[PDB]
Structure 1
Amino acid sequence: QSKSRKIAILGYRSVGKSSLTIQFVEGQFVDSYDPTIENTFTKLITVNGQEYHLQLVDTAGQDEYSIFPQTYSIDINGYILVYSVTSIKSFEVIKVIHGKLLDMVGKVQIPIMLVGNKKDLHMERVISYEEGKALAESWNAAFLESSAKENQTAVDVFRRIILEAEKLE
């Protein structure tokens, strides 16, 4: 009598959706992964004594113009929205995505969190921790920063989204 969460991973293009997800499930940082591929990864994690069966949707990517059709919500238990702290564009884009996603959802409390990835690039960082935090807060969302190089930060991210579901249960 375990539970089952299905998580949508959303974000611009080359912000590390795949790399972050793969890191969590394989224990491995990959060099490249094909950015056409939508793939569902699976994983066990135990959270507050409850064994969870995760399905992780590594979406191909979105942008400003992308379209969230009415059906997308259907069987989605949670949404993780990812930008890169090195691409202002990806931060621009994630605000837009959030807007369209919040419209496609309507009223429901199905949790949404926000992640600043690529934190390991001290020299390439353009977005501050504060900047993304303010966004999350503005949405009443969770906010973590991450690195697909670092396993433990990835674990925090997919663990946190489950937590955020549990809050509302």
Structure 2
Amino acid sequence: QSKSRKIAILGYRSVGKSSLTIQFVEGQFVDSYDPTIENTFTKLITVNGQEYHLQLVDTAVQDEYSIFPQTYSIDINGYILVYSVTSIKSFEVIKVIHGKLLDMVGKVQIPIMLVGNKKDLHMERVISYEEGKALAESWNAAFLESSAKENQTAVDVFKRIILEAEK
């Protein structure tokens, strides 16, 4: 009765994929991470009375040159695509990634969401909320902004992709 879910987190370097993940899992904000080594975490959470057993695959740095596989894996139940609101490059990259991801998964019913991280750095924002939102809307995907410094926003992200997967 405990549900199991594998979630992959994708995106450009230094957008905070690791920090968001560690914050969701361990409740702390970390200022450094091995950016080219893929990490997988496990995490239990109860959502609306249901117990979930999470595996979170925190992917290594990706950019527009990264090889995406041509076939999807049955055991991955959702994809979180992260860019940083402080980096134009990361926003452009996440669009290239979504494109390659779609080529990989085709029409399979595996949810994809879009996250603009680092909303706490408001003096360095270069991506508007509307841009992320409308990009997500054009993908028919969920959209959130987040800050890895703010536990609740990290929780909201992962909770959303779980809710989407069951939709």
**Fold-level similarity (TM above 0.5):** yes
1:61 Cα deviation after fit = 1.8
Structure 2 distance, partners of 1:72, 1:165, is: 16
Structure 2 distance, partners of 1:120, 1:88, is: 16
Name the structure 1 match of 2:60.
60
Structure 1 distance, partners of 2:53, 2:90, is: 30
Q: Unmatched 5+ residue regions in structure 2? A: none
Name the structure 2 match of 1:23.
23
Structure 2 distance, partners of 1:45, 1:115, is: 20
Range moving further from structure 2, 60-69 or 94-103: 60-69
Deviation string for 1:88-113 (max 9, x for gaps)? Answer: 00000000000000000011110000
User: How many percent identity over aligned positions?
Assistant: 99
1:45 aligns with 2:41: no
SS, match of residue 70 in structure 1: coil
Moved over 3 A (4+): none
Structure 2 distance, partners of 1:79, 1:73, is: 12
1:22 Cα deviation after fit = 0.1
1:70 Cα deviation after fit = 3.0
SS, match of residue 102 in structure 2: helix
Instruction: Report the aligned-residue RMSD.
Output: 0.9
SS, match of residue 71 in structure 2: helix
In the superposition, the TM-score normalised over structure 1's length comes to 0.96
In the superposition, the TM-score normalised over structure 2's length comes to 0.97
Q: Unmatched 5+ residue regions in structure 1? A: none
Name the structure 2 match of 1:112.
112
Range moving further from structure 2, 35-44 or 136-145: 35-44
Deviation string for 1:31-50 (max 9, x for gaps)? Answer: 11110221110111112221
Q: How many pairs were matched up?
A: 167
1:71 Cα deviation after fit = 4.3
